[PDB]
Amino acid sequence: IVGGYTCGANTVPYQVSLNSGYHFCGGSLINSQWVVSAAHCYKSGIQVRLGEDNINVVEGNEQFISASKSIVHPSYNSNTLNNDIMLIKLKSAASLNSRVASISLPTSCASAGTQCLISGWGNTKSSGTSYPDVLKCLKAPILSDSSCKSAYPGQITSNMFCAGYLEGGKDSCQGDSGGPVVCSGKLQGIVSWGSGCAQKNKPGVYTKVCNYVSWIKQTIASN
Numbered sequence: 001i002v003g004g005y006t007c008g009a010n011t012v013p014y015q016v017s018l019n020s021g022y023h024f025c026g027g028s029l030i031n032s033q034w035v036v037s038a039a040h041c042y043k044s045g046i047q048v049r050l051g052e053d054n055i056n057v058v059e060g061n062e063q064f065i066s067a068s069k070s071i072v073h074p075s076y077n078s079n080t081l082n083n084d085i086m087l088i089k090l091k092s093a094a095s096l097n098s099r100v101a102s103i104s105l106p107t108s109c110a111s112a113g114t115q116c117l118i119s120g121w122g123n124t125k126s127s128g129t130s131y132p133d134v135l136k137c138l139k140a141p142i143l144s145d146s147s148c149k150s151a152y153p154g155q156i157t158s159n160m161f162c163a164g165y166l167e168g169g170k171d172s173c174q175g176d177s178g179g180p181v182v183c184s185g186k187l188q189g190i191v192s193w194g195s196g197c198a199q200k201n202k203p204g205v206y207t208k209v210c211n212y213v214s215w216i217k218q219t220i221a222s223n
């Protein structure tokens with residue numbers, strides 16, 4: 001998270017870490033047994049780490065549950081990063097508490113101007129390489145599709161939305177992918193991509209989760 005701030009221990013309880021030796025992507029806990037992430041973060045043999053603030057130190061509030069099923073969207077395209085959504089089922093149910101809690105799904109899509117919370121343990125430098133130990137947060141407004149399409153000509157699809165600043169400075173970054181973009185307590189987006197980090201006129205693009213609410217619900221029930 002470039003231009004972010006320390007969230008503060010377990011202030012983002014729904015935030016999970018997709019581990020496979022090292023932290024590679026983020027994610028959200030939508031319910032006791034299901035985690036939502038980005039299809040581009042798909043890896044075989046994932047360990048979902050919950051109750052994490054400082055990823056590098058075992059603060060005892062952690063819960064590490066292996067993934068039993070990984071369900072990537074059928075229409076997902078790696079080239080375009082369209083339909084960059086993936087559902088992961090936990091091997092066992094996460095014990096919900098204060099450090100670990102779920103985030104609700106949206107009933108409607110958000111409007112441009114809506115302030116959202118974007119978080120993760122990803123690169124904080126738009127220039128070099130610097131990764132935090134603790135959880136970083138960033139508040140950014142959902143940009144209008146007019147701005148989004150003008151920022152990325154011929155790249156934005158109806159399943160994507162821009163959030164951040166055309167002045168750059170603040171933006172998600174490498175390693176934040178899969179992470180949550182929560183506006184008003186609803187999971188509205190998933191950290192998908194962007195051209196660089198905090199680049200002027202190049203704000204991060206996120207997966208428009210409200211488009212998949214139906215798919216998600218049917219996927220959750222059947223598996």
Ligand SMILES: O=C(C1CCN(c2ccncc2)CC1)N1CCN(S(=O)(=O)c2ccc3cc(Cl)ccc3c2)CC1
Binds near residue numbers: 131175194195197
């Ligand atoms: O920073 C980036 C991208 C990463 C994706 N991206 C965004 C932008 C905004 N939001 C989400 C993702 C735009 C910048 N890259 C530099 C690093 N390369 S990399 O050599 O493939 C790479 C990949 C993973 C790494 C992990 C670590 Cl721990 C250190 C260096 C790494 C370097 C990929 C592009």
Ligand SMILES: [Ca+2]
Binds near residue numbers: 052
């Ligand atoms: Ca820890």
